[PDB]
PDB file of N, CA, C and O in Angstrom:
ATOM      1  N   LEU K   1      38.752  79.161   1.001  1.00 47.38           N
ATOM      2  CA  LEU K   1      39.177  78.499  -0.042  1.00 47.38           C
ATOM      3  C   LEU K   1      38.999  78.771  -1.039  1.00 47.38           C
ATOM      4  O   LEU K   1      37.195  78.981  -0.910  1.00 47.38           O
ATOM      5  N   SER K   2      39.518  79.391  -2.522  1.00 47.36           N
ATOM      6  CA  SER K   2      39.168  78.966  -3.326  1.00 47.36           C
ATOM      7  C   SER K   2      38.041  77.720  -4.077  1.00 47.36           C
ATOM      8  O   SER K   2      38.256  76.781  -3.429  1.00 47.36           O
ATOM      9  N   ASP K   3      37.173  78.060  -5.049  1.00 45.26           N
ATOM     10  CA  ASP K   3      36.527  77.012  -5.334  1.00 45.26           C
ATOM     11  C   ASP K   3      36.980  75.803  -6.065  1.00 45.26           C
ATOM     12  O   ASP K   3      37.106  74.061  -5.729  1.00 45.26           O
ATOM     13  N   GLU K   4      38.192  75.982  -6.298  1.00 44.53           N
ATOM     14  CA  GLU K   4      39.122  74.831  -7.363  1.00 44.53           C
ATOM     15  C   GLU K   4      40.440  74.130  -5.683  1.00 44.53           C
ATOM     16  O   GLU K   4      40.544  72.741  -5.697  1.00 44.53           O
ATOM     17  N   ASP K   5      40.480  75.054  -4.840  1.00 44.78           N
ATOM     18  CA  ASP K   5      40.974  74.380  -3.788  1.00 44.78           C
ATOM     19  C   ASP K   5      40.067  73.727  -2.731  1.00 44.78           C
ATOM     20  O   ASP K   5      40.149  72.144  -2.788  1.00 44.78           O
ATOM     21  N   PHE K   6      38.677  73.890  -2.708  1.00 42.39           N
ATOM     22  CA  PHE K   6      37.302  72.605  -2.647  1.00 42.39           C
ATOM     23  C   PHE K   6      38.160  71.762  -3.020  1.00 42.39           C
ATOM     24  O   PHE K   6      37.643  70.210  -2.836  1.00 42.39           O
ATOM     25  N   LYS K   7      38.392  71.480  -4.644  1.00 42.99           N
ATOM     26  CA  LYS K   7      37.874  70.291  -5.629  1.00 42.99           C
ATOM     27  C   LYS K   7      38.790  69.486  -5.404  1.00 42.99           C
ATOM     28  O   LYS K   7      39.336  68.487  -5.487  1.00 42.99           O
ATOM     29  N   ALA K   8      39.976  69.868  -5.155  1.00 43.26           N
ATOM     30  CA  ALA K   8      41.003  69.894  -4.783  1.00 43.26           C
ATOM     31  C   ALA K   8      41.620  68.999  -3.753  1.00 43.26           C
ATOM     32  O   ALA K   8      42.603  67.882  -3.213  1.00 43.26           O
ATOM     33  N   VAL K   9      41.297  69.533  -2.726  1.00 43.22           N
ATOM     34  CA  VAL K   9      41.130  69.339  -1.321  1.00 43.22           C
ATOM     35  C   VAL K   9      40.162  68.459  -0.822  1.00 43.22           C
ATOM     36  O   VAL K   9      40.208  66.910  -0.105  1.00 43.22           O
ATOM     37  N   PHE K  10      39.316  68.018  -1.195  1.00 44.01           N
ATOM     38  CA  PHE K  10      37.776  67.351  -0.944  1.00 44.01           C
ATOM     39  C   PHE K  10      37.859  66.761  -2.057  1.00 44.01           C
ATOM     40  O   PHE K  10      36.645  65.787  -1.607  1.00 44.01           O
ATOM     41  N   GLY K  11      38.266  66.550  -2.923  1.00 41.75           N
ATOM     42  CA  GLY K  11      37.466  65.982  -4.531  1.00 41.75           C
ATOM     43  C   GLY K  11      36.043  65.783  -4.161  1.00 41.75           C
ATOM     44  O   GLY K  11      35.264  64.734  -5.221  1.00 41.75           O
ATOM     45  N   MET K  12      35.503  66.754  -4.432  1.00 37.97           N
ATOM     46  CA  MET K  12      34.165  67.289  -4.395  1.00 37.97           C
ATOM     47  C   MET K  12      34.066  68.992  -5.300  1.00 37.97           C
ATOM     48  O   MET K  12      34.400  69.383  -3.931  1.00 37.97           O
ATOM     49  N   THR K  13      32.462  69.688  -5.166  1.00 37.43           N
ATOM     50  CA  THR K  13      32.470  70.926  -4.747  1.00 37.43           C
ATOM     51  C   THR K  13      32.402  71.350  -3.751  1.00 37.43           C
ATOM     52  O   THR K  13      31.909  70.513  -2.600  1.00 37.43           O
ATOM     53  N   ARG K  14      32.852  72.870  -3.471  1.00 37.32           N
ATOM     54  CA  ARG K  14      32.620  73.377  -2.192  1.00 37.32           C
ATOM     55  C   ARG K  14      30.867  73.296  -2.279  1.00 37.32           C
ATOM     56  O   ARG K  14      30.431  72.897  -0.863  1.00 37.32           O
ATOM     57  N   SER K  15      29.902  73.445  -3.180  1.00 39.39           N
ATOM     58  CA  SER K  15      28.583  73.216  -2.659  1.00 39.39           C
ATOM     59  C   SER K  15      28.277  71.890  -2.072  1.00 39.39           C
ATOM     60  O   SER K  15      27.493  71.867  -1.351  1.00 39.39           O
ATOM     61  N   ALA K  16      28.524  70.380  -3.110  1.00 41.23           N
ATOM     62  CA  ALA K  16      28.469  69.344  -2.490  1.00 41.23           C
ATOM     63  C   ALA K  16      29.115  69.119  -1.294  1.00 41.23           C
ATOM     64  O   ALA K  16      28.360  68.446  -0.151  1.00 41.23           O
ATOM     65  N   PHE K  17      30.391  69.468  -0.607  1.00 43.20           N
ATOM     66  CA  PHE K  17      31.059  69.988   0.331  1.00 43.20           C
ATOM     67  C   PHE K  17      30.287  70.004   1.561  1.00 43.20           C
ATOM     68  O   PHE K  17      29.766  69.421   2.773  1.00 43.20           O
ATOM     69  N   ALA K  18      29.621  71.440   1.281  1.00 41.76           N
ATOM     70  CA  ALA K  18      28.996  72.033   2.599  1.00 41.76           C
ATOM     71  C   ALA K  18      27.175  71.228   2.448  1.00 41.76           C
ATOM     72  O   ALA K  18      26.194  71.430   3.399  1.00 41.76           O
ATOM     73  N   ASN K  19      26.494  70.325   1.263  1.00 41.00           N
ATOM     74  CA  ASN K  19      25.205  69.094   1.416  1.00 41.00           C
ATOM     75  C   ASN K  19      25.503  67.872   1.890  1.00 41.00           C
ATOM     76  O   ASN K  19      24.702  67.526   2.436  1.00 41.00           O
ATOM     77  N   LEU K  20      26.891  67.603   2.754  1.00 42.83           N
ATOM     78  CA  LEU K  20      27.591  66.497   3.698  1.00 42.83           C
ATOM     79  C   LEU K  20      26.582  66.828   5.103  1.00 42.83           C
ATOM     80  O   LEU K  20      26.894  67.492   5.468  1.00 42.83           O
ATOM     81  N   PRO K  21      26.180  65.706   5.577  1.00 43.27           N
ATOM     82  CA  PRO K  21      26.168  65.400   6.955  1.00 43.27           C
ATOM     83  C   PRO K  21      26.918  66.305   7.908  1.00 43.27           C
ATOM     84  O   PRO K  21      28.123  66.079   7.494  1.00 43.27           O
ATOM     85  N   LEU K  22      26.630  66.931   9.091  1.00 40.51           N
ATOM     86  CA  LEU K  22      28.253  67.422   9.630  1.00 40.51           C
ATOM     87  C   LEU K  22      28.973  66.269  10.315  1.00 40.51           C
ATOM     88  O   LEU K  22      30.225  66.967  10.049  1.00 40.51           O
ATOM     89  N   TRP K  23      28.976  65.170  10.570  1.00 40.51           N
ATOM     90  CA  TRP K  23      30.096  64.533  10.876  1.00 40.51           C
ATOM     91  C   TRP K  23      30.410  64.421   9.809  1.00 40.51           C
ATOM     92  O   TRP K  23      31.598  63.529  10.180  1.00 40.51           O
ATOM     93  N   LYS K  24      29.796  64.371   8.530  1.00 39.73           N
ATOM     94  CA  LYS K  24      30.853  63.605   7.735  1.00 39.73           C
ATOM     95  C   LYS K  24      31.732  65.357   7.157  1.00 39.73           C
ATOM     96  O   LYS K  24      32.918  64.780   7.110  1.00 39.73           O
ATOM     97  N   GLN K  25      31.635  66.485   7.284  1.00 40.73           N
ATOM     98  CA  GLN K  25      32.488  67.298   7.074  1.00 40.73           C
ATOM     99  C   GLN K  25      33.132  67.090   8.025  1.00 40.73           C
ATOM    100  O   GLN K  25      34.337  67.432   7.808  1.00 40.73           O
ATOM    101  N   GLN K  26      32.959  66.930   8.914  1.00 41.38           N
ATOM    102  CA  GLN K  26      33.867  67.194  10.322  1.00 41.38           C
ATOM    103  C   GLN K  26      34.829  66.151  10.232  1.00 41.38           C
ATOM    104  O   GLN K  26      36.544  66.333  10.040  1.00 41.38           O
ATOM    105  N   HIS K  27      35.040  64.330   9.680  1.00 41.69           N
ATOM    106  CA  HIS K  27      35.263  63.686   9.328  1.00 41.69           C
ATOM    107  C   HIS K  27      36.278  63.895   8.464  1.00 41.69           C
ATOM    108  O   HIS K  27      37.516  63.461   8.561  1.00 41.69           O
ATOM    109  N   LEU K  28      35.832  64.214   6.754  1.00 45.98           N
ATOM    110  CA  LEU K  28      36.751  64.259   6.026  1.00 45.98           C
ATOM    111  C   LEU K  28      37.794  65.270   5.963  1.00 45.98           C
ATOM    112  O   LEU K  28      38.357  65.511   5.908  1.00 45.98           O
ATOM    113  N   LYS K  29      37.344  66.786   6.922  1.00 44.78           N
ATOM    114  CA  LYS K  29      38.045  67.555   7.174  1.00 44.78           C
ATOM    115  C   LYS K  29      39.319  66.814   8.023  1.00 44.78           C
ATOM    116  O   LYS K  29      40.501  67.073   7.989  1.00 44.78           O
ATOM    117  N   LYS K  30      38.473  66.434   9.627  1.00 46.48           N
ATOM    118  CA  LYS K  30      40.135  66.007  10.828  1.00 46.48           C
ATOM    119  C   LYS K  30      40.786  65.145   9.985  1.00 46.48           C
ATOM    120  O   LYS K  30      42.352  65.123  10.311  1.00 46.48           O
ATOM    121  N   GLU K  31      40.964  63.986   8.686  1.00 48.20           N
ATOM    122  CA  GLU K  31      41.603  63.354   8.373  1.00 48.20           C
ATOM    123  C   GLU K  31      42.552  64.078   7.837  1.00 48.20           C
ATOM    124  O   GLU K  31      43.581  62.970   7.873  1.00 48.20           O
ATOM    125  N   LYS K  32      42.448  65.167   7.107  1.00 46.33           N
ATOM    126  CA  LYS K  32      43.343  65.398   6.687  1.00 46.33           C
ATOM    127  C   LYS K  32      44.093  66.846   7.313  1.00 46.33           C
ATOM    128  O   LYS K  32      44.832  67.806   7.276  1.00 46.33           O
ATOM    129  N   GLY K  33      43.846  66.844   8.798  1.00 47.24           N
ATOM    130  CA  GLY K  33      44.141  67.661   9.502  1.00 47.24           C
ATOM    131  C   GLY K  33      43.773  69.317   9.618  1.00 47.24           C
ATOM    132  O   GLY K  33      44.669  70.205  10.194  1.00 47.24           O
ATOM    133  N   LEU K  34      42.423  68.716   8.622  1.00 48.41           N
ATOM    134  CA  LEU K  34      42.033  70.940   8.511  1.00 48.41           C
ATOM    135  C   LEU K  34      40.454  70.912  10.182  1.00 48.41           C
ATOM    136  O   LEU K  34      40.386  69.804  10.395  1.00 48.41           O
ATOM    137  N   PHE K  35      40.498  72.033  10.000  1.00 46.02           N
ATOM    138  CA  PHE K  35      39.133  72.674  11.523  1.00 46.02           C
ATOM    139  C   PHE K  35      37.975  72.356  10.712  1.00 46.02           C
ATOM    140  O   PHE K  35      36.791  72.069  11.092  1.00 46.02           O
TER     141      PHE K  35
END
């Protein structure tokens, strides 16, 4: 994903996303249908 894609998809920056606990990364992806 591009940096702006991360912002559009997750409502936070790439680095912010990568800094979340893994359960939370997984949940934020799964609720959108992502892997």
